[PDB]
Subunit: 248 residues, 4 copies
């Protein structure tokens, strides 16, 4: 079977269209299903609270654009944009976007990277979590607060102080092992190596997991995991870390 | 190297985001360069002249969205929209859209499906051509006439006459081997299996080519060919017909 | 399904274990069946008549070794050894080797490179053929004569005259496009790019095919084609020339 | 670059030719190097002490057979056959086989699955280990003894009582998670999910590792790890468990 994968992304976001295809490409070596990727974009170059709200306005229009392609699953990407709207807004965004695709006769399951990260942590049975984000301090405080408010405790967190979404995309993932290794990780159940949708994390995931001996999640994997589960499919995916290997 | 590929598609279009990734996915078995695919949508459900002009207006918007992602090449899918704007428009669209990406501090080479088809036909040394399209009669006249206007004779042509863009993508490609055989192909230098970006063709390509003993081109393969030449990469792609091996 | 592929190769041969996996690796992008490859070796360094008879003796030994692995198909690589045993020997080798696998409680279909080439040529409707081989003159006479004996006219043929089997595998395939163009190909139904299992050809295949506008076959592609027909699997393989798409 | 991978295997062994290619195929999605696989076989259908010694006699002849193909690395497979010859014989077998390829002018690095498993455990810094084998009790006692004698402590071990090497190949890997989960694994640094070269383990590796939170090794991964290290190459391989992700 062919699965049509839909992705609403920030215009400048390059990672989701890399890591999600990479994961599912890897899945095709282990499971029969074969995937095709389809994207709609909303303009956004710089990660600021105002540029994020504006981008969330185009959220609906992108879901229209993607339902025109009778897509099997929709992944609404920007994690930070939802968490900056208020508490538990991921659930709101999901409902709303679901309705959009219904008002287009193409009812599709809709998955946010925010909700995917929350559901992903719980699916592991992780009560305490560490977080790495590329964003500026106040913006990451929102992310940490949002997670804490979703019932998940946050131990040690880190902001990498980058706002240029392009520069975030060109952040070397092999910095990440060293970064995580300098955080208090042992007091923690699971490591959120990227509470972000733009920062490359895939190539560090298994490396980090190996040297920290704690499960490692990034939004990308959490989204693919959610997409997989939403289509009632096995979630074994080589190089997908702990979450992507018999946890669904 | 990782080459980032941008694609401007009609919202309903599902073929370009299949056949081009598929094509490049195969080039990865032969050449070291890796590809990532990034897409932007423009609303349009039914293939009509008025909806084609509307869609072409949103062309600039999309080129902004994809140049926000510092994309290495741009593919403006949907040749029919270009050819229904009048003769030679592929060059006009190219020129303007390149300016758009320059004006966004990320100058990239831009490729129209129309221009690719013409240039690809020329690269074969083909002077006469047979054409298959899924469009209605008038819209297939526009395409045939436009090709002729570019110094290429059009022999036999056929319309499938499907106006709904979702039914065009649901068309069985295994019909095409038959459909083409009932045309005149001996007096024709090359076969345009699909003068469309929405009708699946790739799976029929080398199969038609085999029985006709004549070179076979789709809009998809041409776009992929053009992109590779724009990047100064070798153009051999397994299962991509004549045009995609030491091309050409 | 996982199809297990057995290959009897000359110890020095490195081409069969490349081009066939490569071919099937591409069939995995088009068809759901997965392949595993299992090989058995017979000592032979230099391509001479006496060393060819010696190698053919060890043929049975190998067929035991590979049927110990309950292999789904067997490929007896090296057509020259078969064709230097005298006319029609491909059928004799097949028959006997099948008996060998039956006698080991694992009856499997057995395919000679020789028989495949003949059968593949026949499946094209090709009555005349051009041949390129890396062998010395006498050994290329044997091949040409043997083909003729199977009711297929041999037009122009060429020898590369390399006796050392390691230098045959180190041969640049990009020479072949040129080498073939300086032959007569217009009066010939199809081109045997490689009447050898040790000379690399696959990368030149669709490229030669393009410029000649004539069907191109290697021993490798024929073996792969034969194996697929033996299994009742569709024979479309991307980048496998005419013979490998809705074959044929 | 193309890397020629050589593998000496039991005639009936189907797993090495599956899991080693699978791993390295997976590596090609993460690293530039591309691999080709070449096998020589020694006859063996049933895992018994006598049939193992006989098979180790052909060990040299297979190394001759493979050096005829100027191979980059040689993996001598059968793990149990070496450990049943005496203490620390893996080091002896390596030296001897190395000499064979030198007496063939094709000096190649030679890797045994035995030595690869020993080196693999140490490379993790694992002083205590759990073991699963498919073999009959006394034969697995040899394996356990051999490891203990190599300085590595064995906690809880398991024999699955199967001698038919074919039946070992058709052992469901999803039995393995349940099997391991019924062993005392927490007293142990690393899990040897397959102290064997024939029992499929690849598909359970990440699943086991996830639910046991201890590093998981099988001979296949240990061999690929060793092969990779011997060619001075990065050892990141998706789905390769802990050992195959930045440990070299």
């Amino acid at each position: 079977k062919v699965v049509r994968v839909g992705q609403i992304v920030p215009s400048s976001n390059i990672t989701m269209e890399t890591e999600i295809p990479a994961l599912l490409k890897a899945r095709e070596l282990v499971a029969p299903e074969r995937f095709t990727f389809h994207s709609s974009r909303m303009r956004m170059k710089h990660v600021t609270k105002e540029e994020l709200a504006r981008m969330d306005g185009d959220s609906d229009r992108c879901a229209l654009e993607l339902s025109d392609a009778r897509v099997d699953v929709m992944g609404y990407a920007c994690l930070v944009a939802i968490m900056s709207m208020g508490h538990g807004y991921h659930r709101v965004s999901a409902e709303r976007l679901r309705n959009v695709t219904e008002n287009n006769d193409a009812a599709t399951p809709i998955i946010t990277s925010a909700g995917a990260l929350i559901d992903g942590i719980r699916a592991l049975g992780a009560k305490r979590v560490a977080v790495v984000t590329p964003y500026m301090k106040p913006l990451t405080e929102l992310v940490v607060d949002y997670i804490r408010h979703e019932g998940i405790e946050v131990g040690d967190y880190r902001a990498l102080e980058i706002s240029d979404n392009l520069a975030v995309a060109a952040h070397d993932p092999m910095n990440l092992p060293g970064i995580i290794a300098s955080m208090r990780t042992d007091d923690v159940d699971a490591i959120v190596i990227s509470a972000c949708v733009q920062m490359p994390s895939l190539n560090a995931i298994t490396m980090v997991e190996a040297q920290t001996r704690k499960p490692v999640i990034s939004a990308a994997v959490a989204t693919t995991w959610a997409m997989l589960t939403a289509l009632d499919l096995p979630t074994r995916v080589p190089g997908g870390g702990t979450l992507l290997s018999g946890a669904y």
